[PDB]
Design an enzyme around this catalytic site. Structure first.
Site, PDB file in Angstrom:
ATOM      1  CG  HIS A   1      -1.921  -1.188   1.185  1.00 24.42           C
ATOM      2  ND1 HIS A   1      -2.649  -1.508   2.313  1.00 24.42           N
ATOM      3  CD2 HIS A   1      -2.162  -2.128   0.231  1.00 24.42           C
ATOM      4  CE1 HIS A   1      -3.311  -2.628   2.009  1.00 24.42           C
ATOM      5  NE2 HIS A   1      -3.026  -3.042   0.776  1.00 24.42           N
TER       6      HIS A   1
ATOM      7  CG  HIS B   1      -7.473  -2.804  -1.800  1.00 25.12           C
ATOM      8  ND1 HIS B   1      -6.927  -1.714  -1.172  1.00 25.12           N
ATOM      9  CD2 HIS B   1      -6.740  -3.902  -1.498  1.00 25.12           C
ATOM     10  CE1 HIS B   1      -5.905  -2.178  -0.463  1.00 25.12           C
ATOM     11  NE2 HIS B   1      -5.759  -3.492  -0.631  1.00 25.12           N
TER      12      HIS B   1
ATOM     13  CG  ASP C   1      -3.458  -5.085  -2.915  1.00 25.71           C
ATOM     14  OD1 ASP C   1      -3.031  -4.271  -2.041  1.00 25.71           O
ATOM     15  OD2 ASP C   1      -4.326  -5.933  -2.685  1.00 25.71           O
TER      16      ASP C   1
ATOM     17  CG  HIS D   1       0.179  -9.582  -2.411  1.00 29.51           C
ATOM     18  ND1 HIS D   1       0.078  -8.278  -2.877  1.00 29.51           N
ATOM     19  CD2 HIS D   1      -0.723  -9.767  -1.428  1.00 29.51           C
ATOM     20  CE1 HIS D   1      -0.867  -7.713  -2.142  1.00 29.51           C
ATOM     21  NE2 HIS D   1      -1.372  -8.571  -1.257  1.00 29.51           N
TER      22      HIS D   1
END
Ligand SMILES: C[C@@](C[C@H]1CN(c2ccc(C#CC3CC3)cc2)C(=O)O1)(C(=O)NO)S(C)(=O)=O
Ligand SMILES: [Zn+2]
EC number: 3.5.1.108
Length: 297
Positions: free
Chosen positions: A78, A235, A239, A262
């Site tokens: 973030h 969001h 990311d 991720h």
């Protein structure tokens, strides 16, 4: 020319780690040209410094974690998204604990604190990674792709398979739209059905309605609701922007994510870096002919 950027003044913030629940003091400091973004564990003696680079990612379970031996810097995505969105090339990030503070769960507080401190253009050309060939990584039903594009754009699609979505989420952003007004305020989110399993893995110990959209089947537990109709997919874009910034330079190209998290984001970066035919480093001697532009410093 498009110049490298650093911070004009130091930024200081206090918060808690999303996963550890630990209290953490954060200090953002200016850095010289070509430093890149460097995380500094100032609670350790000697201080342990970890460059925010793809090669330093050691864990990708519910966050991006930088690792150097037995030392970690957790949940960098973030803050990195905020730094990427504002065009900050060089900075030292001091932390008094193993995890960046979660703040309100979005990049909003970081963009505000940085823009309040102001930016400083440096006497050196900003370096960009330009995508020349298509590069894709897949694993099962997840896919992450870089495509050549004269600018910077992110597309994301995800079938969350969850009742809160009322039966697939999708968004596309071309950053020439405001990262600040349309993506920075999108909060992280958690599901009540996962919380027992997460706490058992020592994850989301600091998680609450104060720093995330908390879902319980059909309900959004947050009394004040959502900031955007599509906050969840926005969001996921935030990311991806943060994870992509582990390349160490801003991208000139397009990113397309399909249920990519991720782990897959980092695998895409590693595949790209290994494929030197697919990218090149470029600078712009004249901002007027460049395919990207940044806000005034
Ligand atoms: C991993 C992720 C979600 C975060 C957010 N989160 C989370 C989990 C549970 C709760 C909760 C809760 C209730 C007990 C209060 C809050 C956040 C978590 O474990 O990881 C993220 O944004 N990373 O950057 S995501 C959107 O799933 O990729
Ligand atoms: Zn996130």
């Amino acid at each position: 020319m498009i110049k490298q950027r650093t911070l004009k003044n130091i930024i200081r913030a206090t918060g808690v780690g999303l996963h550890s629940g630990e209290k953490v003091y954060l200090t953002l400091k200016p850095a010289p040209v070509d430093t890149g973004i460097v995380f500094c564990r100032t609670d350790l003696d000697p201080v342990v410094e970890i460059p925010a680079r793809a090669e330093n990612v050691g864990e990708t379970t519910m966050s991006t974690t930088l690792v150097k031996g037995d030392v970690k810097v957790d949940t960098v995505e973030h803050l990195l998204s905020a730094m990427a969105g504002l065009g900050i090339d060089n900075a030292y990030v001091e932390l008094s604990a193993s995890e960046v503070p979660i703040m309100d769960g979005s990049a909003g507080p970081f963009v505000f604190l940085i823009q309040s401190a102001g930016l400083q253009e440096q006497e050196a050309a900003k370096k960009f990674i330009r995508i020349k060939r298509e590069v894709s990584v897949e694993e099962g039903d997840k896919r992450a792709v870089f495509v050549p594009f004269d600018g910077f754009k992110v597309s994301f699609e995800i079938d969350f398979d969850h009742p809160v979505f009322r039966g697939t989420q999708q968004a596309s952003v071309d950053f020439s739209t405001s990262f600040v007004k349309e993506v920075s305020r999108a909060r992280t989110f958690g599901f009540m059905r996962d919380i027992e399993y997460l706490r058992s893995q020592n994850l989301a110990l600091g998680g609450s309605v104060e720093n995330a959209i908390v879902v319980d089947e059909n309900r959004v537990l947050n009394e004040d609701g959502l900031r955007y109709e599509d906050e969840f997919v926005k969001h996921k874009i935030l990311d991806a922007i943060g994870d992509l910034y582990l390349l160490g330079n801003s991208l000139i190209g397009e990113f397309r994510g399909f249920k990519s998290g991720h782990a897959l984001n980092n695998q895409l970066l590693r595949t790209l870096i290994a494929d030197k035919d697919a990218w090149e480093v470029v600078t712009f001697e004249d901002a007027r002919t460049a395919p990207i532009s940044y806000m005034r410093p």
